[PDB]
């Protein structure tokens, strides 16, 4: 009967748990205890980008570390020249309910999506001077949470229908459907080799997928609320997660369990965005309490604070050259910190 | 600034001139969110997103319904949430009262008011006059409940219907008075399927919502 099959799951769930405790000979805190603390990180707002007339839900940097894309509920994508604070483009959107935005690695395309269940791809640089829709990708039965590019014709999306999808934009149809989550998927991060990606879902689980195959290689369960953010370590062998339980956690792919927890009794608000620095020594997380925190990723000690926003900090990014950090908030502003 | 950087700056100024112009059109439209379980007649009141536009007294209204604990954070800056409840199907009123509690007590909707249309007050009249079904089986407190003598706006209807009516309204207003802190209000109405006065009631309610926003800008309330 179904009880026999359900009994085998409990056997393995304790076999994985047992075989995972055979690897915890020491903790990350003991090993990195005798390394000098980073210090106090004093970052000042170098730019403020004005022009959005509603809340900002997503931003994404460019590989050139100079251009970035921003999404807002006013229904407009703006591409900014962060050095000069100029507006390169303003892209009107069919739906005002935008939750995600991606900037293609080549820079030719920007993606968007949200409550319309459609990932819309935009051709930035083309004749006619203007930005126009190249493809509307349909097929998800829930809202679109995050989208990231692997190539000009290769994109991964996460939706509230408990699934992630791999698309071919030239064909316009799903190539792989990643199934295995029992709740909405709120974030995903792409490995630096573009051969793996992690997904954080509202079932308090994080799953590592193989893009070429379409399988869930590992499942990580250490949180206790919805996972809202996720980000790979620069090495590609670890990732950090952010949850509504006011904790950031570090997970190792090779050992396959959690290495560190970033909590503090003063913080009781959830984490909206998470990001690493170029070397991995700093973990930056945005919070609902109007401000952002900078943690030491090896000693778990707070290393500073970025307090400059008048509402919820919704997005957070670090440039590929590590020169700048950009935050966005529901107060309709972006800020470049250095 | 070079010749090209100067020309880029002038382009950036013209994008602003159009962002603000669009913001002016955005400021004069009132956004609403429609909620309610199936069998609520939700889509038949003003007679994954289905936008609906109606205007009353030269004021533009804009209604969205999604076809939820996560995406509800998007609608943190709406004028009102319209909650539509069938007052006839006594089985699922508990689901309606629990649906309403979670929306009222939600962290991102702490300053969003709720307009409460109780659909199918004509079907309720049938079930309360026919006698086959009784509220007391589903809500035990009905038996020990007496109609308020003061609150008697009942024009030409049986006191049995008005007892049945005002009890269902209490079960929703009490959830609103429990944990509200005065920052947001619930407005309870009573609408059938042939009701045509609906667009006005949303309007007359939004005019009060906006008044209470201005009384909080000037520290008056």
């Amino acid at each position, epitope marked *: 009967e179904l009880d026999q099959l359900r009994q085998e799951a409990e056997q393995l769930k304790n076999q994985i748990r047992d075989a995972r405790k055979a690897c915890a000979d020491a903790t990350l805190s003991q090993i990195t205890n005798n390394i000098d603390p980073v210090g106090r990180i004093q970052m000042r707002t170098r730019r403020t980008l004005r022009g959005h007339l509603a809340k900002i839900y997503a931003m994404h940097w460019g590989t050139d570390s100079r251009l970035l894309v921003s999404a807002s509920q006013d229904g407009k994508l703006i591409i900014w020249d962060s050095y000069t604070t*100029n507006k390169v483009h303003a892209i009107p959107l069919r739906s005002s309910w935008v939750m995600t935005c991606a900037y293609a690695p080549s820079g030719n395309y920007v993606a968007c999506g949200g409550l319309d269940n459609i990932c819309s791809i935009y051709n930035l640089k083309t004749r006619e001077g203007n930005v126009r829709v190249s493809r509307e990708l349909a097929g998800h039965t829930g809202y679109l949470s995050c989208c990231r590019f692997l190539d000009d014709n290769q994109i991964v999306t996460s939706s509230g229908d408990t699934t992630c999808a791999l698309w071919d934009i030239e064909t316009g149809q799903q190539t792989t459907t990643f199934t295995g989550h029992t709740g909405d998927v709120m974030s995903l991060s792409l490995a630096p080799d573009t051969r793996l990606f992690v997904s954080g879902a509202c079932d308090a689980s994080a799953k590592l997928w193989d893009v070429r195959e379409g399988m869930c290689r590992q499942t990580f369960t250490g949180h206790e609320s919805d996972i809202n953010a996720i980000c790979f370590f620069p090495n590609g062998n670890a990732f950090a997660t952010g949850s509504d339980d006011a904790t950031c956690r570090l997970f190792d792919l090779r050992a396959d369990q959690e290495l560190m927890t970033y909590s503090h009794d003063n913080i009781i608000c959830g984490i909206t965005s998470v990001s690493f620095s170029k070397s991995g020594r700093l973990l930056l997380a945005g919070y609902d309490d109007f401000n952002c925190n900078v943690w030491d990723a090896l000693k778990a000690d707070r290393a500073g604070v970025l307090a400059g926003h008048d509402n919820r900090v919704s997005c957070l990014g670090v440039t590929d050259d590590g020169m700048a950090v950009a935050t966005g908030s529901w107060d309709s502003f972006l800020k470049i910190w250095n | 600034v070079s010749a090209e950087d100067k020309a880029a700056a002038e382009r950036s100024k013209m994008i602003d001139k159009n962002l603000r112009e669009d913001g002016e059109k955005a400021r004069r439209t009132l956004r609403l969110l429609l909620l309610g379980a199936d069998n609520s007649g939700k889509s038949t009141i003003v007679k994954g997103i289905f936008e609906t536009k109606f205007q009353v007294d030269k004021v533009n209204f804009h209604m969205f319904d999604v076809g939820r604990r996560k995406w509800i954070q998007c609608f943190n800056d709406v004028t009102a949430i319209i909650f539509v409840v069938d007052s006839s199907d006594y089985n699922r009123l508990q689901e309606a009262l629990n649906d309403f509690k979670s929306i009222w007590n939600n962290r991102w909707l702490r300053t969003i008011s709720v307009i409460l249309f109780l659909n199918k007050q004509d079907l309720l009249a049938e079930k309360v006059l026919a006698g086959k079904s009784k509220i007391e089986d589903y809500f035990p407190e009905f038996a020990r409940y007496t109609t308020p003598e003061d609150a008697t706006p009942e024009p030409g209807e049986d006191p049995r219907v008005t007892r049945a009516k005002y009890f269902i309204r209490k079960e929703f207003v009490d959830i609103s008075t429990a944990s509200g802190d005065g920052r947001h209000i619930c407005y309870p109405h009573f609408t059938c399927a042939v009701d045509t006065e609906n667009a006005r009631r949303i309007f007359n309610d939004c005019k009060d919502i906006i008044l209470q926003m201005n009384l909080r800008e000037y520290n008056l309330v």
Partner: single-chain antibody
Amino acid sequence: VQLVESGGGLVQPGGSRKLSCSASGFAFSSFGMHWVRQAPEKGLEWVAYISSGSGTIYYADTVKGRFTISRDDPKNTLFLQMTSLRSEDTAMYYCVRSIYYYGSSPFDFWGQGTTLTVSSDIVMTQATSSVPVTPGESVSISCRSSKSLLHSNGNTYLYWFLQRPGQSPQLLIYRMSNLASGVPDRFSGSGSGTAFTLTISRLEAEDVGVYYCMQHLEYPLTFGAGTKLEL
């Protein structure tokens, strides 16, 4: 994308004319439009510029005070009104669209022009004037300037143009290094301030003409004498 011009024809000295160009195929309003003329046998000379929104207008000193530039955004048409024409105002007038933002390619499209037959400054020089070359062989075209074209923001504002016989000029290299859209990868650009070169590796036919180098550092926009390549 098209830029078709009207007007032209013989005009007596001291007269007036209104040259007009019509756009069809691109967002004409988001583009700045230039006027560049070319005497019957001389090089390219820049006349006027009107920005998007018409909020910025520049003229060359030759035509200042007596030529007026204007645009009609709803009708997609660019104008140039003449007053007190001269014997030095004889040329073929070209219409150029230019778009300015970060990473853009200005001077992309040139419309085939109209012929009018009326009956300090950054001087920058192309020392060579004619290069007789063999097909398939790499050729190098070099022009220099009076002052450095390298700005404080790292952009070297120099543009390379090509004019095939009986054809409008088109863009090859913008900002000393960047190829235009549709240009073969055999073209290349290099140089420092006041020293520039254009290398055409693996030369081929349909690539012979007069090569122009322009500065965009500041107005007036100064072109070069023009180095032509013949078989």
